[PDB]
Paper text:
Human enteropeptidase (hEP), also known as enterokinase, is an essential enzyme in food digestion and is localized at the brush border of the duodenal and jejunal mucosa. Activated hEP can stimulate the conversion of trypsinogen to trypsin via cleavage of a specific trypsinogen activation peptide, namely Asp-Asp-Asp-Asp-Lys (DDDDK), which is highly conserved in vertebrates. However, the mechanism of hEP activation remains to be established. hEP contains a multi-domain heavy chain and a catalytic light chain, linked by a disulfide bond. The functions of these domains and motifs may be involved in protein anchoring, macromolecular substrate recognition and inhibitor specificity. The light chain is homologous to trypsin-like serine proteinases with a typical Asp-His-Ser (D-H-S) catalytic triad responsible for peptidase activity.
Upon cleavage of the hEP into heavy and light chains by trypsin, the enzyme became fully active as shown by the protease activity assay. The protruding LCM region was not resolved in the active hEP structure even after extensive 3D classifications. There was also no evidence of cleavage of the LCM domain as we observed only two bands, corresponding to the intact heavy and light chains, upon activation. This set of results indicated increasing dynamics of LCM relative to the hEP-core upon activation. Inspection of the cryo-EM structure of this active hEP-core at 3.2 Å resolution revealed an overall shape equivalent to that of the inactive state. Superposition of the hEP-core regions of the active and inactive states revealed additional density near the catalytic site in the active state, corresponding to the surface loops L1, L2 and LD not resolved in the inactive state. The IVGG sequence was observed to be flipped by ~180 degrees, with Ile785 shifted by ~16.6 Å. The newly exposed N-terminal amino group of Ile785 formed a salt bridge with the side chain of Asp970 to stabilize loop L1. Upon activation, the conformation of the catalytic triad Asp876-His825-Ser971 appeared to have remained unchanged. Upon activation of the zymogen, the flexible L1, L2 and LD loops form a complete and rigid catalytic pocket ready for performing catalysis.
Author numbering:
A (entry chain B): 785 to 1019
B (entry chain A): 524 to 784
Write the structure that this text describes.
């Protein structure tokens, strides 16, 4: 996130940080007591050794990991979507399993999944989160950043993104003048949209041309299409 | 980039491009492993030694332009054998522009239902992992199959307006059927809510008897396991219109304040 402010502790009890080799690389979202949902392009080529992925739940600041609210866990299974294609950047979604269960606390809560035949109308503000970068050519952010971006239509996004092929499994979000959008280092970041006092999972950060650019929105994996594929593993 | 291409049964053994010494950088090869109609592919790697995550081998099961993904292998180590499901397998080698490794070497074979073990007949239920459990783990409260398929959905809604609404359609071993509410309590209510992946039991009430199938009588027990007997002896049956709310979804329960800034 480049155009957002710091988040309050406990504001996003589902956004978790995935560390690969003592370094934050990708983000995920708590959906169950032992399962996660993240982008497949960041775990592409690392699903062979799930033990190298340590999930940090309830993370607020990247410098305070010994806090009692933080509950670290280890990954034992990484499932990449079968329809994924790194070249076309389509179906960019993957699930990661936890070794031990995590007790739901005041700072750790699972995110909600959009039900079947539930479409989000364009022009609707959906909040984002993640420990991304505050600028394109810079460094990461120690505090959990968050912002709010409005949704766009597939036709308008395809018209504004000619370098890519926006399929029906993608949902875009961003401002016309830019400035407020996610950037690199925040892969797998959720596109959280409130719906009747509930924050659904309306999108997983898939890719993007360039952040903080006018008329260059960010593309998110439409989770409403992969609802049954995610629920198949939650059982 | 311009290495080998589609092969057939007489041509199984193939290197990547220069497996004896090392593969070049920025390579993008493809080995479309064809077969006969109804014969899958079993790709066994005789040797595998590549670079880190930056160099991977993507194995697909396309059969058309809508290709799927089977496995992504990288790094040195003996990789598992990939079992296809169609008569076409696409192997993509994506390499970086530095630190070139040796390569790999694999040969495939055709057959019928390779990988998937032979399902045992004569009333033997086979879960997704292949383990056989005839009646010892057929939705009874055990975990014989390690993949969790032995506890598959033996209960679901029926004629429901929204997602979290419907009937009490159950299934003991094979046949699906509804249930009655002669001794319906909140305990079994929240039990069947949790079994369907829902929250706490809400207001549930019948309307009128309409289904004549083998209805079941749900009973409670102090040990935790539910005892149900699908007996066809009941008058003025009550079809439970199960209306149960969702689980504890992403509701911010922290002590956040109000600040429109
Ligand atoms: C972690 O949080 C505690 C809370 O008081 C603070 O004292 C400490 O300085 C923090 N550590 C870092 C590295 O920010
Ligand atoms: C979580 O809840 C279980 C069940 O009450 C309890 O045994 C356990 O101590 C709790 N904490 C952890 C870290 O599992
Ligand atoms: C979305 O948020 C922007 C500011 O970030 C605001 O100007 C706009 O009115 C909001 N849209 C809706 C529909 O609330
Ligand atoms: C996007 O892909 C679809 C599917 O092949 C194709 O029909 C369409 O013409 C493509 N659009 C662009 C702009 O490449
Ligand atoms: C196997 O490869 C040889 C060498 O190119 C070729 O002549 C032969 O036709 C191939 N066998 C097939 C395609 O079944
Ligand atoms: C690949 O070659 C090895 C070496 O003999 C062989 O054991 C294996 O069966 C081959 N894989 C096939 C035929 O799928
Ligand atoms: C469900 O709806 C179908 C639609 O015709 C009807 O035939 C059936 O009797 C209904 N079942 C119940 C239990 O209402
Ligand atoms: C409920 O259980 C009791 C247990 O004896 C039984 O007599 C009764 O017929 C059942 N049904 C109703 C509607 O009470
Ligand atoms: C049942 O659902 C309704 C829906 O608004 C809710 O108001 C009510 O509190 C729920 N009752 C219980 C017992 O959960």
């Amino acid at each position: 996130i480049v155009g957002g402010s710091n988040a309050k502790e406990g504001a996003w009890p589902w956004v978790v940080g995935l560390y690969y080799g003592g370094r934050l690389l990708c983000g995920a979202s708590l959906v169950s007591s032992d399962w996660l949902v993240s982008a497949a392009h960041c775990v592409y080529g690392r699903n062979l050794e799930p033990s190298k992925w340590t999930a940090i739940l309830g993370l607020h600041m990247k410098s305070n990991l010994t806090s009692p609210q933080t509950v670290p866990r280890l990954i034992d299974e990484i499932v990449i979507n079968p329809h994924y294609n790194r070249r076309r950047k389509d179906n960019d979604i993957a699930m990661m399993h936890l070794e031990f269960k995590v007790n739901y606390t005041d700072y750790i809560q699972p995110i909600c999944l959009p039900e079947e035949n539930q479409v989000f109308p364009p022009g609707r503000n959906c909040s984002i989160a993640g420990w991304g970068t505050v600028v394109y050519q810079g460094t990461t952010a120690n505090i959990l950043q968050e912002a709010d971006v409005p949704l766009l239509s597939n036709e308008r996004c395809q018209q504004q993104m000619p370098e890519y092929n926006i399929t029906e499994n993608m949902i875009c979000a961003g401002y016309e003048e830019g400035g407020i959008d996610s950037c690199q280092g925040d892969s797998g970041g959720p596109l959280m949209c409130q719906e009747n006092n509930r924050w659904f999972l309306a999108g997983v950060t898939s890719f993007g041309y360039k952040c903080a650019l006018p008329n260059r929105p960010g593309v998110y994996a439409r989770v409403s299409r992969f609802t049954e594929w995610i629920q198949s593993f939650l059982h | 980039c311009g290495g080998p291409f589609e092969l057939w049964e007489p041509n199984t053994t193939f290197s990547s491009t220069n497996f004896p010494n090392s593969y070049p950088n920025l390579a993008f090869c493809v080995w479309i492993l064809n077969a006969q109609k109804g014969k899958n592919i079993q790709l066994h790697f005789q040797e595998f030694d590549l670079e880190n995550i930056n160099d991977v081998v993507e194995i697909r099961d396309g059969e058309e332009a809508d290709s799927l993904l089977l496995a992504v292998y990288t790094g040195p180590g003996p990789v598992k054998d990939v079992f296809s499901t169609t008569n076409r397998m696409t192997v993509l080698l994506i390499t970086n522009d530095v630190l070139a490794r040796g390569g790999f070497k694999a040969n495939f074979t055709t057959g019928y239902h390779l990988g998937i073990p032979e399902p045992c007949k004569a009333d033997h239920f086979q879960c997704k992992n292949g383990e056989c459990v005839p009646l010892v783990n057929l939705c009874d409260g055990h975990l014989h199959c390690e993949d969790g398929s032995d506890e598959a959905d033996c209960v679901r809604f029926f004629n429901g307006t929204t997602n979290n609404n419907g009937l009490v359609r159950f299934r003991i071993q094979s046949i699906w059927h509804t249930a009655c509410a002669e001794n319906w309590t909140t305990q079994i209510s929240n039990d069947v809510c949790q079994l369907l992946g829902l929250g706490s039991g809400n207001s549930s009430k019948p309307i009128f008897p309409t289904d004549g199938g083998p209805f079941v009588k749900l009973n409670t027990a102090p040990d935790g396991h539910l005892i149900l007997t699908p007996s066809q002896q009941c008058l003025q049956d009550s079809l439970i219109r199960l209306q149960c709310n969702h689980k504890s979804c992403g509701k911010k329960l922290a002590a956040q304040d109000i600040t429109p800034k």
